[PDB]
Amino acid sequence: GLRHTFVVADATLPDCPLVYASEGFYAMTGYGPDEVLGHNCRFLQGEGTDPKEVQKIRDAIKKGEACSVRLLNYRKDGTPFWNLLTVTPIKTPDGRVSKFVGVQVDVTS
Ligand SMILES: Cc1cc2nc3c(=O)[nH]c(=O)nc-3n(C[C@H](O)[C@H](O)[C@H](O)COP(=O)(O)O)c2cc1C
């Protein structure tokens, strides 16, 4: 299988904080749950992250749509990796967005 990590963000809170992350997410990024849970995942961004790709995710989240972007991200120790990020909205039967799920793939290669 393709190596990847997975997270769940709560779309019922205004800033889409993370409520769950797979073990690989913590291992890959170097952050622990104490530093991650309850926070928006944007802490992974840094100097070289392309604001235009970030904008795409921001837009997809506001519209409740899925989106896939390639983003420069940084580990806790400050080292970079290329992240192919797919975000999927999870909707309740009334059509409202409850959760976003994110799949990260380290495509640094
Ligand atoms: C489920 C989910 C997973 C996300 N995963 C990442 C990620 O791995 N790396 C990243 O830079 N941003 C990720 N984001 C994007 C940020 O959390 C945030 O939505 C993005 O930076 C746009 O918002 P902002 O303009 O307010 O920062 C994720 C967002 C969601 C909802």
Author numbering: 17 to 125
Which passages does the manuscript contain on this structure?
As expected from the CT characterization, the CrPhot­LOV1 crystals belonged to the P6522 space group. Overall, the electron density was of excellent quality and enabled us to observe variations in the positions of residue side chains (with an RMSD of 0.189 Å between the dark state at CT and RT).
This ability relies on the light-induced formation of a covalent thio­ether adduct between a flavin chromophore and a reactive cysteine from the protein environment, which triggers a cascade of structural changes that result in the activation of a serine/threonine (Ser/Thr) kinase. For example, in the green algae Chlamydomonas reinhardtii (C. reinhardtii or Cr), phot allows the light-dependent regulation of several molecular processes (e.g. phototaxis, sexual differentiation, photoprotection) and control of gene expression. The C. reinhardtii phot protein consists of two successive photosensory protein modules, LOV1 and LOV2 domains, and a Ser/Thr kinase effector domain [Fig. 1(a)].
